[PDB]
Each structure stands twice: as C-alpha cells, then as structure tokens.
C-alpha cells in the first residue's frame, strides 16, 4: 500500500507505506551510513552486497520515529545517470534495505550531476516543496547523518583512509541542518576531526571594484592589444564580451582561427584599421603571451594584460554553477583546468606589458534564487 516510486529526469523518490509529513526530519545518507557491504569489500560486488552498518541502527530509528521525526534518505547514485547501475535494480535494493530497517522511510535519489547531487541542496528543496504535504520543516530541529564527512585519516582503527568526500557534511551546511557522522550519531563516539574545502562560496561577494587599480581605464581610445589571462570557466569571456567587445574591441580566439599566422594577420589587420583587439583565451604561460606582445610591439601599439584572479577552485565552482543554471554554457572539463594550472605563470611587466589590470573574482546581477544557489558548496 505504499505510494511507491516516482521518477523524474534527475531524481527518484520512494515513499513507503506509513510515511507521514512532519515539521522535523531525521535524514540519512545510505551507503556507509545505514548500510555497508556484506562482502567486506570497499565496493559492492552486486546489488545484494549489503548489510545494515551497525546493529544499533534500527533502535535509533524506532526512537526517532516515535518522537515524530520524519525518516528520510538522501542518496547520491550517479551510477544510475551514467548507465552503470540499472535504476530498476537499485530501486529493489532500496526496498529490501527498508524492509530490513523495519520503519517507514521516504527516499530521494540523485541520479545525475547537478542541482540534486549532494552537497547541492536540490533534494532537500524537493522534499520541502513537493514531498511533505506543504508542512514547513524546522531545519534547526532536524538532523542529517552521513559518512561523507571530510574526516582525516585514522579517526578509528581500520580507517587509514580519509573520507572519500565531504558531501554529506556540506549538504547539511548548505541547508542549515545539524550534522553528525554515523558513529557519532548511532554509537555516541566522540566527534571526529574533519576538514572543509579551502574555498567557501559563502564568503563570495558582489562588492568591491570591477578591476584594479581603480585609477586605470578598461578601455583605450587608441589601438592596443589586451591579453586576457585566467582559468577557463570563471567568467573571462563574459567579462570580455560585456566590457570590451561591446565597446568595439575585436575578439580574437586562436583556437578557432587554426594557425598562429592567421591569428597574427587577424590582429594586425584589426590594428591597421585603427581597431582595438582582445585575446580571449586562457594564455597561461610566458611563451603563449609573448606572441601577442610581439605582435603589438611590431605594430607599435600598447599591450595590456587583464589578469583574472579566480583560483582553480573558484573557477571549478563557477563552472558547476553555470552547468546547473545556463543551458548555453559549455562545460569546462577537469582535464582543461588541470592542464591550465600546470602551465600557469603569472604575468609580469617584464614580458612587455604597458600595464596589468587585476580582475577580482566576484559574484555576477543574478536573480535572488540564483545568488542563494551560488553560495552553496557544490562539490564534496
Ligand atoms: Mg555515503
């Protein structure tokens, strides 16, 4: 008599018989939190390779349900979106686990990257907005329990390995939920040491100057070559389009001209016509930039560098954000980010730049909802 499974593009939801909406929730991850492998291997050998993680678990769940907590699972299962784990098989595994736990659960399953993948709070919002009969949930009175908690190596005998991820802890931080690991919650073990990511998108801002030094000017009245430098996926092209190309700068993209000679001819022709040029590429190294500086030198026009300050993790954050929110965004691969960092050398005046502007990494004028999303951790 369970309502059963609902299937959405990037979400599965199961609602067991006996689930009731409530004003407070006790939520759990699945793998490594309520279950682990029966085989004793790190990864399951089959769909049936599971056992309840600790014998203490069903007693705690019975107590929570009697106290009026709605019991919920929030589980990341990317293998489904990637075609490695059949949805219909995973659904059966979940039902079997729930039968063994012996209490009514509502389960939410993030099958893909993006809005629903912890730590992004998409599943919470779905629970609250669509799957709780309109009853507001007190986050302060709720709890999330998971093993992707960013713990350091050796927090217990047999754990010479740090947690694979901090996604569970960060999900709870994004929602504002009190958080505990499975051992802290079910076994009353002392709290384990953990680390958060170095980049905290909650401290991102829209304030401050667009570029430094403020006494400089984005535009020049005369021909010149501007060389943009910075990680891909962190908003360079958008900036360049908004502030330079819109002002008549000729956009040069070496990647699409093919050869170097065609790129310089293009630059030279623009300058000969009295135009200004911007090179909108990553340009991470001295040799990469030297070609454009030499071109400018040969033409007798100034070369300036716009140096975008975005760090690798800011850029990767921005890229994930745009993947989730902008249907036209071209995803930047981790390979390309990695490659850029490996090749990067900071620009200096000795290369031959007239001046270097720094472009700080700042929040876009995004919709209120998108600004809330921008401030969420999106990778564990
Ligand atoms: Mg887990």
CA of 331 to the centre of ligand 1 (A): 27
Question: Do 1-196 and 197-380 show the same overall fold?
Answer: yes
Question: For residue 219, what are the contacts with CB-CB under 8 A and spacing of at least 6?
Answer: 244, 247, 276
Does residue 352 have a known ligand-binding role?
A: no
CA of 148 to the centre of ligand 1 (A): 5
Question: For residue 226, what are the contacts with CB-CB under 8 A and spacing of at least 6?
Answer: 244, 249, 276, 277, 278, 279, 303, 304, 305, 306
Residues 317 and 120: their CA atoms lie apart, in Å, by 12
Residues 276 and 223: their CA atoms lie apart, in Å, by 5
3-state SS of the chain: helix, strand, coil percent to 5? 35, 15, 50
* Sign of the CA dihedral with 283 first, then 285, 287, and 292 last: positive
Residues 313 and 231: their CA atoms lie apart, in Å, by 10
Helix (H, G, I), strand (E, B) or coil at 289: helix
CA of 29 to the centre of ligand 1 (A): 5
CA of 88 to the centre of ligand 1 (A): 20
Helix (H, G, I), strand (E, B) or coil at 263: helix
Helix (H, G, I), strand (E, B) or coil at 24: coil
Q: Are 232 and 281 in contact (CB under 8 A)?
A: no
In the chain, what are the domain boundaries? 1-196, 197-380
Q: Which CATH architecture has domain 197-380?
A: 3-Layer(aba) Sandwich (3.40)
CA of 28 to the centre of ligand 1 (A): 9
H helices of the chain, in order, are 57-66, 78-81, 87-101, 122-130, 167-175, 182-187, 236-243, 254-257, 260-272, 286-299, 312-325, 334-343, 368-374
CA of 146 to the centre of ligand 1 (A): 6
Strand partners, 74: 108
CA of 132 to the centre of ligand 1 (A): 24
Does residue 215 have a known ligand-binding role?
A: no
Cα 202 versus chain centre, distance: 13
Q: How was this structure determined?
A: X-ray
The order of strands in the sheet holding 355-359 is 250-252, 277-279, 225-229, 303-308, 355-359
Structural fold of domain 1-196: Rossmann fold (3.40.50)
């Amino acid at each position: 008599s369970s309502l059963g499974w609902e299937s959405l593009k990037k979400l599965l939801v199961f609602t067991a018989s006996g689930v009731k909406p409530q004003g407070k929730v006790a939520a759990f991850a699945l793998d490594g939190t309520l279950i682990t492998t029966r085989s004793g291997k790190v990864f399951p050998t089959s769909p049936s390779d599971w056992r309840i993680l600790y014998p203490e678990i069903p007693k705690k769940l019975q107590e929570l349900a009697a106290e009026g907590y709605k019991l919920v699972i929030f589980t990341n299962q990317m293998g489904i979106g990637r075609g490695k784990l059949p949805a219909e098989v995973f659904k059966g595994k979940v039902e079997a686990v729930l039968e063994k736990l012996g209490v009514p659960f509502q389960v939410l399953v993030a099958t893909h990257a993006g809005l629903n993948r912890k730590p992004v709070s998409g599943m919470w919002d779905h629970l609250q907005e669509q799957a709780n009969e309109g009853i507001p949930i007190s986050v302060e009175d709720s709890v999330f329990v998971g093993d992707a908690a960013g713990r350091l190596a050796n927090w217990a005998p047999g754990r010479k390995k740090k947690d694979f991820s901090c996604a569970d802890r960060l999900f709870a931080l994004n929602v504002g939920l009190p958080f505990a690991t499975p051992e802290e919650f079910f076994l009353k073990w002392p709290a384990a040491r953990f680390e958060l990511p170095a980049f905290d998108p909650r401290t991102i801002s829209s304030a401050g100057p667009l570029y430094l030094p403020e006494s400089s000017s984005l535009l020049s009245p005369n021909p010149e070559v501007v060389v943009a430098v910075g990680f891909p996926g962190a908003g360079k092209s958008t900036f360049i389009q908004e502030h330079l190309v819109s002002a008549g700068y000729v956009h040069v993209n070496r990647d699409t001209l093919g050869s170097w000679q065609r790129c310089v001819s293009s630059c030279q022709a623009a300058l000969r016509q009295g135009k200004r040029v911007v090179i909108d590429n990553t340009n991470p190294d001295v040799p990469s930039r030297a070609r454009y500086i030499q071109c400018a030198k040969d033409a007798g026009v100034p070369c300036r560098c716009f140096n975008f300050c975005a760090t690798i993790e800011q850029a990767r954050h921005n890229n994930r954000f745009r993947e989730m929110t902008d249907p036209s965004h071209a995803p930047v691969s981790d390979m390309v980010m990695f490659s850029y960092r490996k090749q990067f050398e900071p620009p200096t005046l000795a290369e031959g730049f007239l001046e270097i502007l720094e472009i700080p990494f700042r929040l876009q004028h995004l919709d209120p909802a998108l600004q809330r999303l921008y401030r969420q951790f999106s990778e564990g």
